């Protein structure tokens, strides 16, 4: 698309031909193959300058050595010009350092919002009340229950005398809403508590969702960020269940602790629980609701772009962005390693419009060659075959490679082979998924892109990059026990995927692409789709890439700060 190609050019212009800080990078050509290295070091950049000063002062105050760029071997950072990034699809120009998750409250809050969330069915609990206590559940009793719950869930008492409670001003991000596929019930619940499926989604998407979940009722629970940050993801479902239990006891005048209560506990903790993700094996041991457990389908469903857009590519690209950030920057780059981590491994897929350029080109190519297959629709899709994948992925990769070759700025932007690999394979995979409505065809496309890339340049990614690559093509359509899985159900714990940067966010994007091409309401879990269809959440899930930009320019307000109870 001409508008994306132009937008890519503008990103290259901003990054490389307009001065940033003191880098002296005014003027020049985005197609030229040469650069003058001024060896200015870190001070050329305004953030680095601020970091240097803070480091020196803190080292002095605390009496043990700290941040000091002169500790870098040979020479300090920035022997070549330090240049900025534009968040793709936006005009937000960010400092590189401001996109490190540690430095970026929007990124931290995105993870918090997911970690602190679970979904708990209400039907099982209502049946319990009816069966064991002979209670009638009505809209009125539910309304009273939800008022109780919205008091109790943040950490407040409903039963005992002489209780201490969380300070409301510390836990203002905690709340519980409901959604239901029962339209009549929906109309009778106090609107303050309802995620309105018929209002939040298009008519087509609402119908898909309702048909999927039938006439079931669900609680979308978000526990306090402050608690999530003190503890872990495995906390979430436990917290939810405790306060659900207390609220039932109070709202329905049960015995404060009787056998029937245990049934409510089992339902909330197990039988009617939907976690963001499941637990992880010993080597990377973690309980539920950690990044590793979060399937690609799940992430696709949390991200809300699918709900507010009708552009299949845009929807997939938002998921790629959210995915590379969470999976690479926080999960792989922190949880599974740490230190400086993997900012730019991830930014490559959500900045400077390079990925977008390749993807949108691919849409045009597909539409031209496969009779509008990439347009939103179901019966315009092409059946997944080796031929279709070879066609689309090869074309995609060739174009993306030629772009990197014709624009030395783009090559220098994505200076790491891995970055380029993610970009090229993401486009290829999304493209294949868009045409076929088959997420695993997307995966085939992803792997073939890697194969073409390696032969073209006689290099691919980092030392360990293509473990999953080389296992990739063969495991796409394997049906062996620990090999076979639709990409929708794959995630960071799929064995080949469990280690390496530059993949997981792409796979999330591919999963979404199979469904967004179809205009599908969700990728794998409607419960998560509806749960996050909620503007009260701190993080704007409809626009994750922009949100990261808002965090970079210090305009994102996170939950969970403790300034209330800290010295001033």
């Amino acid at each position: 698309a001409a508008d994306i190609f132009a937008k890519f050019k503008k990103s290259m212009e901003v990054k490389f031909t307009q001065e940033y800080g003191s880098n002296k990078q005014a003027g020049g050509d985005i197609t030229g193959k040469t650069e003058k290295f001024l060896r200015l070091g870190p001070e050329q950049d305004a953030r680095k300058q601020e970091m240097i000063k803070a480091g020196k002062e803190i080292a002095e105050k605390r009496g043990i050595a700290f941040y000091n760029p002169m500790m870098h071997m040979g020479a300090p950072l920035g022997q070549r010009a330090i240049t900025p990034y534009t968040i793709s699809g936006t005009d937000i120009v960010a400092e590189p350092d401001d996109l490190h998750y540690v430095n970026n409250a929007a990124m931290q809050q995105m993870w918090d919002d997911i970690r602190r969330t679970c979904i708990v069915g209400l039907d099982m609990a209502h049946e319990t009340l009816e069966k064991r206590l002979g209670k009638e559940v009505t809209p009125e009793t539910i309304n009273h229950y939800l008022e109780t719950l919205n008091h109790a869930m943040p950490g407040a008492a409903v039963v005992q005398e002489m209780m201490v409670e969380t300070h409301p001003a510390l836990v203002d991000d905690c709340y519980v809403k409901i959604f239901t596929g029962d339209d009549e019930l929906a109309d009778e619940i106090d609107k303050q508590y309802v995620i309105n499926v018929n209002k939040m989604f298009s008519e087509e998407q609402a119908a898909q969702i309702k048909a999927s979940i039938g006439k079931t009722t669900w609680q979308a629970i978000h526990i306090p960020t402050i608690v999530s940050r003190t503890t872990d993801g495995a906390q979430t479902s436990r917290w939810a269940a405790m306060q659900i239990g207390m609220s039932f006891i109070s709202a329905y005048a049960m015995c404060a602790g009787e056998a029937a209560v245990a049934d409510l506990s089992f339902a909330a903790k197990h039988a009617a629980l939907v976690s963001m993700g499941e637990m992880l094996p010993a080597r990377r041991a973690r309980g539920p609701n950690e990044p590793g457990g979060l399937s690609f389908g799940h992430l696709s469903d949390i991200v809300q772009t699918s709900r507010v857009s009708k552009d299949p590519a845009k929807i997939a690209l938002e998921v790629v962005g959210a995915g590379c950030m969470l999976y690479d920057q926080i999960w792989l780059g922190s949880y599974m390693s740490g230190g400086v981590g993997f900012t730019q491994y991830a930014t490559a897929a959500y900045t400077d419009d390079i990925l977008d350029n390749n993807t949108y080109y691919d849409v045009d190519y597909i539409n031209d060659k496969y009779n509008g297959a990439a347009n939103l629709g179901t019966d315009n899709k092409v059946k997944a075959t080796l031929d279709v994948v070879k066609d689309i992925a090869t074309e995609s990769t060739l174009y993306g490679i030629e772009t990197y070759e014709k624009f030395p700025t783009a090559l220098e932007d994505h200076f790491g082979g891995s970055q380029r690999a993610t970009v090229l394979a993401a486009a290829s995979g999304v493209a294949c998924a868009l045409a076929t409505g088959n997420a695993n065809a997307g995966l085939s496309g992803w792997y073939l892109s890697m194969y073409v890339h390696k032969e073209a340049w006689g290099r691919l990614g980092f030392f360990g990059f293509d473990l999953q690559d080389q296992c990739g093509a063969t495991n796409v359509l394997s049906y062996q026990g620990d090999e076979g899985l639709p990409d929708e159900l794959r995630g960071p714990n799929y064995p080949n995927y469990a280690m390496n940067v530059g993949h997981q966010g792409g796979y999330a994007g591919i999963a979404q692409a199979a469904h967004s091409g179809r205009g599908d309401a969700f990728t794998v879990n409607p419960l998560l789709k509806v749960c996050f269809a909620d503007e009260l959440m701190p993080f704007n899930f409809a626009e994750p890439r922009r949100e990261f930009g808002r965090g970079a320019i210090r305009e994102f307000m996170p939950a969970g700060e403790r300034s209330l109870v800290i010295p001033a």
Binding site: G32, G74, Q79, E402, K454, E455, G458, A473
Partner: protein, 247 residues
Amino acid sequence: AYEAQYYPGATSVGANRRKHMSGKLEKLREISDEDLTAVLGHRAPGSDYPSTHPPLAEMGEPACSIREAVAATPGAAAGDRVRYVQFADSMYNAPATPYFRSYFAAINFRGVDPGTLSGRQIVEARERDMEQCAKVQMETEMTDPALAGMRGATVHGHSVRLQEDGVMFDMLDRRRLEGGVIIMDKDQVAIPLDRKVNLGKPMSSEEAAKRTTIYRVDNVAFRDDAEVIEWVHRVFDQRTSYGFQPK
């Protein structure tokens, strides 16, 4: 006897890749033993090879039919440390590409530990065995001293725009054009040497274009190499199909 065919493709990129893999490489320059040792930075030039374990002849070896069948390298026999040589190569038609450097090592040298990355390629081997490998890479068309650099750390440059003098960026400035020749005056981890190592004149842009193992759309376009694309497609179709059912 089976004769290797190495790699598909009829373009210059094909011929170059086959040259790299087979080790059929033109010698373009010379580096003395002592100069090579110097830039590698593992021991003083001319000094004995330090060891990591006693020589095989001294400590003896377990009863093993494989140890008995497979001759130790000189470096293995002597108990040398495993040390390395590492190179970065410009995407702007440096003769070498990482994979092809590794293929060259694996095909032509015994007891080697090649590793391929986008920005660097390394050979780890017993010190004296490694040096023979470094010598070949350094003296042949495989390395252009401007478009490539021996770098054990801080390898950044392969994907960066060239300096106006046609030299690939080195954050640590280990080598540069002086008097029309490339001088390396630091070791591969950028510790300054007490010597200036003369690596001779760089290739012209024209020559590098003809000698490169890399494809580029403004040189030898990958898009146009139907034969190598076919290779990729064949391997892809096989791997996919056989992972479903190996038949």
